[PDB]
Enzyme design. Structure first.
Site, PDB file in Angstrom:
ATOM      1  N   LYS A  84      75.131  29.898 -65.046  1.00 52.06           N
ATOM      2  CA  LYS A  84      75.986  30.288 -66.165  1.00 52.06           C
ATOM      3  C   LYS A  84      76.233  29.053 -67.032  1.00 52.06           C
ATOM      4  O   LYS A  84      76.543  27.980 -66.491  1.00 52.06           O
ATOM      5  CB  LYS A  84      77.318  30.867 -65.656  1.00 52.06           C
ATOM      6  N   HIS A 102      90.318  20.208 -57.423  1.00 56.66           N
ATOM      7  CA  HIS A 102      89.159  19.341 -57.118  1.00 56.66           C
ATOM      8  C   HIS A 102      89.637  17.910 -56.796  1.00 56.66           C
ATOM      9  O   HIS A 102      89.100  17.303 -55.876  1.00 56.66           O
ATOM     10  CB  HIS A 102      88.190  19.238 -58.300  1.00 56.66           C
ATOM     11  CG  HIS A 102      87.580  20.524 -58.770  1.00 56.66           C
ATOM     12  ND1 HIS A 102      87.900  21.054 -59.995  1.00 56.66           N
ATOM     13  CD2 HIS A 102      86.623  21.292 -58.207  1.00 56.66           C
ATOM     14  CE1 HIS A 102      87.175  22.152 -60.127  1.00 56.66           C
ATOM     15  NE2 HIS A 102      86.386  22.335 -59.083  1.00 56.66           N
ATOM     16  N   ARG A 146      89.737  27.353 -50.582  1.00 59.48           N
ATOM     17  CA  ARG A 146      90.986  27.877 -51.136  1.00 59.48           C
ATOM     18  C   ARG A 146      91.472  29.094 -50.366  1.00 59.48           C
ATOM     19  O   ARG A 146      90.703  29.729 -49.640  1.00 59.48           O
ATOM     20  CB  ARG A 146      90.773  28.290 -52.590  1.00 59.48           C
ATOM     21  CG  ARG A 146      90.682  27.131 -53.544  1.00 59.48           C
ATOM     22  CD  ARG A 146      90.029  27.626 -54.809  1.00 59.48           C
ATOM     23  NE  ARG A 146      88.567  27.635 -54.711  1.00 59.48           N
ATOM     24  CZ  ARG A 146      87.764  27.717 -55.761  1.00 59.48           C
ATOM     25  NH1 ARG A 146      88.269  27.783 -56.984  1.00 59.48           N
ATOM     26  NH2 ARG A 146      86.446  27.702 -55.600  1.00 59.48           N
ATOM     27  N   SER A 161      88.438  26.892 -61.754  1.00 63.99           N
ATOM     28  CA  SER A 161      88.155  26.463 -63.125  1.00 63.99           C
ATOM     29  C   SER A 161      88.010  27.710 -64.022  1.00 63.99           C
ATOM     30  O   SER A 161      88.501  27.689 -65.153  1.00 63.99           O
ATOM     31  CB  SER A 161      86.878  25.631 -63.187  1.00 63.99           C
ATOM     32  OG  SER A 161      87.038  24.405 -62.496  1.00 63.99           O
TER      33      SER A 161
HETATM   34  N1  LIG Z   1      91.580  24.713 -56.528  1.00 68.95           N
HETATM   35  C1  LIG Z   1      90.679  24.248 -55.648  1.00 68.95           C
HETATM   36  N2  LIG Z   1      91.108  23.866 -54.424  1.00 68.95           N
HETATM   37  C2  LIG Z   1      90.206  23.489 -53.510  1.00 68.95           C
HETATM   38  N3  LIG Z   1      88.874  23.432 -53.618  1.00 68.95           N
HETATM   39  C3  LIG Z   1      88.478  23.811 -54.839  1.00 68.95           C
HETATM   40  C4  LIG Z   1      89.291  24.207 -55.892  1.00 68.95           C
HETATM   41  N4  LIG Z   1      88.529  24.534 -57.002  1.00 68.95           N
HETATM   42  C5  LIG Z   1      87.293  24.351 -56.598  1.00 68.95           C
HETATM   43  N5  LIG Z   1      87.188  23.916 -55.301  1.00 68.95           N
HETATM   44  C6  LIG Z   1      85.978  23.597 -54.548  1.00 68.95           C
HETATM   45  O1  LIG Z   1      85.353  22.478 -55.151  1.00 68.95           O
HETATM   46  C7  LIG Z   1      83.917  22.653 -55.142  1.00 68.95           C
HETATM   47  C8  LIG Z   1      83.388  22.667 -56.555  1.00 68.95           C
HETATM   48  O2  LIG Z   1      83.955  23.809 -57.215  1.00 68.95           O
HETATM   49  P1  LIG Z   1      83.436  24.299 -58.676  1.00 68.95           P
HETATM   50  O3  LIG Z   1      82.969  23.214 -59.538  1.00 68.95           O
HETATM   51  O4  LIG Z   1      82.574  25.512 -58.551  1.00 68.95           O
HETATM   52  O5  LIG Z   1      84.824  24.833 -59.239  1.00 68.95           O
HETATM   53  P2  LIG Z   1      85.333  26.336 -59.137  1.00 68.95           P
HETATM   54  O6  LIG Z   1      86.791  26.424 -59.400  1.00 68.95           O
HETATM   55  O7  LIG Z   1      84.881  26.900 -57.775  1.00 68.95           O
HETATM   56  O8  LIG Z   1      84.468  26.995 -60.300  1.00 68.95           O
HETATM   57  P3  LIG Z   1      84.295  28.452 -60.913  1.00 68.95           P
HETATM   58  O9  LIG Z   1      85.689  29.004 -61.059  1.00 68.95           O
HETATM   59  O10 LIG Z   1      83.544  28.324 -62.200  1.00 68.95           O
HETATM   60  O11 LIG Z   1      83.551  29.284 -59.855  1.00 68.95           O
HETATM   61  C9  LIG Z   1      83.662  23.885 -54.278  1.00 68.95           C
HETATM   62  O12 LIG Z   1      83.610  23.403 -52.933  1.00 68.95           O
HETATM   63  C10 LIG Z   1      84.932  24.708 -54.519  1.00 68.95           C
HETATM   64  O13 LIG Z   1      85.241  25.715 -53.558  1.00 68.95           O
HETATM   65 MG   LIG Z   2      83.060  27.417 -58.236  1.00 63.46          MG
END
Ligand SMILES: Nc1ncnc2c1ncn2[C@@H]1O[C@H](COP(=O)(O)OP(=O)(O)OP(=O)(O)O)[C@@H](O)[C@H]1O
Ligand SMILES: [Mg+2]
Ligand SMILES: Nc1ncnc2c1ncn2[C@@H]1O[C@H](COP(=O)(O)OP(=O)(O)OP(=O)(O)O)[C@@H](O)[C@H]1O
Ligand SMILES: Nc1ncnc2c1ncn2[C@@H]1O[C@H](COP(=O)(O)OP(=O)(O)OP(=O)(O)O)[C@@H](O)[C@H]1O
Ligand SMILES: Nc1ncnc2c1ncn2[C@@H]1O[C@H](COP(=O)(O)OP(=O)(O)OP(=O)(O)O)[C@@H](O)[C@H]1O
Ligand SMILES: Nc1ncnc2c1ncn2[C@@H]1O[C@H](COP(=O)(O)OP(=O)(O)OP(=O)(O)O)[C@@H](O)[C@H]1O
Ligand SMILES: Nc1ncnc2c1ncn2[C@@H]1O[C@H](COP(=O)(O)OP(=O)(O)OP(=O)(O)O)[C@@H](O)[C@H]1O
Ligand SMILES: CC1=Nc2nc(N[C@H](CC#N)c3cccc(Cl)c3)nn2C(=O)C1
Ligand SMILES: CC1=Nc2nc(N[C@H](CC#N)c3cccc(Cl)c3)nn2C(=O)C1
Ligand SMILES: CC1=Nc2nc(N[C@H](CC#N)c3cccc(Cl)c3)nn2C(=O)C1
Ligand SMILES: CC1=Nc2nc(N[C@H](CC#N)c3cccc(Cl)c3)nn2C(=O)C1
Ligand SMILES: CC1=Nc2nc(N[C@H](CC#N)c3cccc(Cl)c3)nn2C(=O)C1
Ligand SMILES: CC1=Nc2nc(N[C@H](CC#N)c3cccc(Cl)c3)nn2C(=O)C1
Ligand SMILES: [Mg+2]
Ligand SMILES: [Mg+2]
Ligand SMILES: [Mg+2]
Ligand SMILES: [Mg+2]
Ligand SMILES: [Mg+2]
EC number: 2.7.7.3
Lengths: 160, 160, 159, 159, 160, 159
Positions: free
Chosen positions: E42, E18, E91, E129
């Site tokens: 959730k 992020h 991703r 996450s």
């Molecule tokens: N490792 C990462 N690299 C790039 N973009 C990411 C990454 N993790 C999350 N994002 C993006 O950041 C935004 C917010 O993601 P979010 O808060 O849902 O985290 P997440 O890792 O996707 O969560 P979860 O695993 O609970 O689904 C979305 O656009 C998501 O695709």
């Molecule tokens: Mg997510």
């Protein structure tokens, strides 16, 4: 050939995407049963009685559609309805892998039942009942994606 | 090389697809540990004691397989078992993206552990324990997909 | 237990991604045959003799690797090398779909030959010999993606 | 209800996977037109006349099949055959993406022509005419994947 | 052009993936709102107050980022914030199909809002996450994937 | 904040899908360079001079677009255009996989150049220059998918 087809699903609620698929099915098959799952794994927003009434009103203009509730295996339902075609809608956003699992399992259970995949208009290729419900719960405009009766029922459901 | 491999999963219940993968693993590696998750995130249909007994009976004909329950990180388990290979089964219907996430995370946790992807027979390429359980719960024939002991245990479980 | 694996491909030219896969294979199996396809249908940049020499120099530090060229059906070549494992590398979904077709066909031709798929480091997960050649053809720097001997050979071929 | 379907493709050569799809189509529709594209852009192994003869012999046991060659736009050919269904076979995701583009373009050209996708047996889910030709070119056994008449024709063409 | 962009999500917790996406967004747009969902479907591991504090501390070095909680439709939030760009991180392991559904629905709700997909470093292309939390719950090392403040908060959360 | 973006491609010919993407880019960034690759490796239908003229006429209504041809490595061309954003369009999964490889390679060559992916209208989500050319080669109507000037040029080229 006097072909009978089933179009199974939860239809929670029926959308314009489902209407598009059942309409295309009515053009190729003599009789189409729009089959509504009584007891899905996830608790539906609309009760079975509500899902059936909404689908009936939204398909009333299609003379060769019958809306029926079912609680058994979709292959067992097709078998009892003397259907030889099972209709699946394939969206641009479909889980193609799950559709393959389902079709091969349905063929194991009833080899005389053929799975037929139909594609909706580009207009409905990117929606689902889940997405529509999430947008509407968060106070978004979903009118374009639903038949008028479903739009009214969804507003009433979310009001209470 | 005296290679030790682990084959982790929930095995809820073990199917002919899992049997196919562990059999292929026994042909290439000296010792294979079929590793059963004790406490998965989703409550399993079969208890750990049932999953272990079923897997043991279904792999008893394979001399170089050991069935073991585990509750830790699969990389921590491999480390403690002196295993240098982690077996994953790759179905036609696999979530390839999740397999990539898992392998890269496993490599971060234990870089000396290599992930090895094996492909099952076309016969089992389109099934999962989840799909088999859903079909059986809805009174469908799943005999072809299971070892005989598992077929008996599943019938008993669904009867009550 | 005297396990022999074959890692077949065009290797036109061999990249750090291919080196990553063959290195992982050597840590698993007693002997690895890196098998270079003559592959005239793909109109390769390097001749088979050049590809074999480049891969031999690039893998000389790995004691249990043997580099060989072949024009045979890959399942017949694996049988004739006494190999029971066929190594393939998976970078992404595009690899996965074709690799499934290939592995089911190889199984039909030689059922006792097991296809084993390995995943490269994240560092090389997004590269291919085609992509490296396209960047080099446009005078872009590809030193990071190739063994030293291969980089100098690629620069010479395009010169 | 006097339903006519067209199953278009290159069929270079027709395989057991294509036979599986056309057989499923004949159990659904009154008349099926197996339509073989001249397809010069793909530089086919067999001439159109050869492909039509092979498919006719391979489908002779199915009473409601008609084999025809065409060079026309496939939507115009379906219209001229009085077909309202266009059959396509889906083996995997690679098929799905391109088949969506093709079906939306066919819908733009002939909205009343419905594309219907069918899935083959697991037995033929991983084969293509290209893969079968590549194995045969390297002297690998492909008898399992082709009708007898097609296998003998393929062996003769490569001889 | 004085461009305002939103970067919405649950951020439960914010990871280095992020951080990578919001940093890239700050280089192309004048103002970036990192928008944290108050009430996801959730139940989150971290409360909204915790998620906001962690994201603020982890982005404090970026002068043109503002962290804000929201409970409405992400398109309604963008509209009220006068944002014309919605940032999504893509991703290697992304559900591309879901990203297409979401972008087309967001365009239906607010056509003047453009969805912009940014790609993270290869270093964070295979994490989420959810995956980080599952590894940490099973006593795995996730330090490399998190900002220091998040590593401390996650250790504290799992201790109790 | 004086932001310059480059939108590179073959544009053989420019379609309504490309126009949709460049229009979205002009609403985001101060100046957009629509960069047409000479691309001899793809054996294009239109010469580079023709592709540049067609795109200039098709984008003349957008004030902050500049159409230019190039044979350079695209990351070097972006640097020389003082661009810090490289626009790519995503129609489906096939685009996504290759676009990831390309974007990671462009990042290696120019880390400060950010790849930005945009999604077209549902109307153009299933079209490509190749598909439009194939339909037109078979005398199918493609007026819906192309700017007027491009449609007349395509009809003339095939005549
Ligand atoms: N490792 C990462 N690299 C790039 N973009 C990411 C990454 N993790 C999350 N994002 C993006 O950041 C935004 C917010 O993601 P979010 O808060 O849902 O985290 P997440 O890792 O996707 O969560 P979860 O695993 O609970 O689904 C979305 O656009 C998501 O695709
Ligand atoms: Mg997510
Ligand atoms: N927008 C749509 N276009 C085409 N087919 C659709 C569409 N929505 C659903 N279908 C198909 O109709 C059938 C019944 O779908 P179902 O009742 O599950 O609705 P759904 O949108 O898939 O539901 P959910 O979002 O809850 O998973 C399935 O074959 C499904 O793929
Ligand atoms: N039919 C099968 N063929 C090949 N590999 C399989 C098959 N079923 C499971 N596997 C693999 O075996 C391992 C253990 O699988 P697991 O216990 O989760 O069963 P599952 O079918 O994946 O379960 P579930 O359906 O509950 O997700 C994983 O590597 C999984 O991909
Ligand atoms: N970067 C890489 N990481 C992992 N595996 C790879 C990589 N490059 C190639 N492979 C795998 O190695 C094997 C041989 O590949 P091959 O010789 O075709 O190289 P390639 O990079 O795919 O070349 P080309 O671009 O010319 O098709 C295949 O299984 C391929 O998927
Ligand atoms: N094994 C198969 N199972 C199911 N459908 C198939 C199979 N082979 C081809 N099809 C489908 O039949 C139609 C015609 O295919 P086509 O003539 O291109 O053969 P192909 O096997 O794809 O050949 P090629 O490898 O030369 O592209 C297409 O819809 C294709 O997806
Ligand atoms: N219909 C479209 N919608 C959105 N983006 C598109 C569309 N067509 C092309 N693009 C994107 O525009 C860029 C340039 O594309 P390019 O010139 O290769 O055209 P193309 O339609 O893909 O042509 P070809 O079929 O010849 O490969 C790429 O990022 C491509 O994905
Ligand atoms: C091969 C399979 N066959 C199956 N049949 C059913 N039937 C239930 C009936 C009820 N309620 C159902 C539930 C939800 C949606 C639908 Cl469409 C159908 N489920 N099921 C599978 O999960 C797999
Ligand atoms: C990188 C990861 N490593 C992991 N190890 C474990 N272990 C648990 C142990 C128990 N019960 C488990 C649960 C369910 C199935 C399996 Cl196979 C293993 N989970 N886990 C991840 O989710 C991710
Ligand atoms: C099931 C298959 N078996 C096969 N064997 C070969 N052999 C040739 C040998 C040469 N030159 C080859 C060509 C290119 C790359 C490789 Cl790795 C191997 N090709 N082939 C297939 O296409 C399918
Ligand atoms: C929307 C489209 N309509 C189309 N019609 C044709 N026709 C040719 C006829 C010849 N030779 C053809 C070539 C190869 C295979 C087939 Cl099945 C058909 N091609 N085409 C497209 O590429 C797209
Ligand atoms: C087209 C859509 N627009 C949407 N907006 C929201 N907003 C909620 C706000 C809260 N809590 C939310 C929940 C979880 C994560 C995020 Cl990023 C945002 N959800 N939502 C959709 O599911 C689909
Ligand atoms: C990382 C990469 N950088 C690259 N730069 C170029 N440039 C050529 C210029 C010409 N003709 C080109 C050809 C076709 C389309 C485009 Cl958009 C650009 N190609 N290339 C790659 O294939 C990979
Ligand atoms: Mg559904
Ligand atoms: Mg599983
Ligand atoms: Mg390759
Ligand atoms: Mg084909
Ligand atoms: Mg293109």
């Amino acid at each position: 050939m006097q072909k009978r087809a089933i179009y199974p699903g939860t239809f929670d609620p029926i959308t314009n995407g489902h209407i598009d698929i059942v309409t295309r099915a009515t053009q190729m098959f003599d009789h189409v049963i729009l089959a509504i799952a009584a007891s899905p794994s996830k608790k539906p927003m609309f009760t079975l009685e509500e899902r059936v009434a909404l689908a009936q009103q939204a398909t009333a203009h299609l003379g060769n559609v019958e809306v029926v509730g079912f609680s058994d295996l979709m292959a067992n339902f097709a078998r009892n309805q003397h259907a030889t075609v099972l209709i699946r809608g394939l969206r641009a956003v479909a889980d193609f892998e799950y559709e393959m699992q389902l079709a091969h399992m349905n063929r194991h259970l009833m080899p005389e039942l053929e799975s037929v995949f139909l594609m909706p208009s580009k207009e409905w290729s990117f929606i689902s009942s889940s997405l529509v419900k999430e947008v509407a719960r968060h106070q978004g405009d979903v009118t374009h994606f639903l038949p008028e009766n479903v739009h009214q029922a969804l507003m009433a459901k979310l009001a209470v």
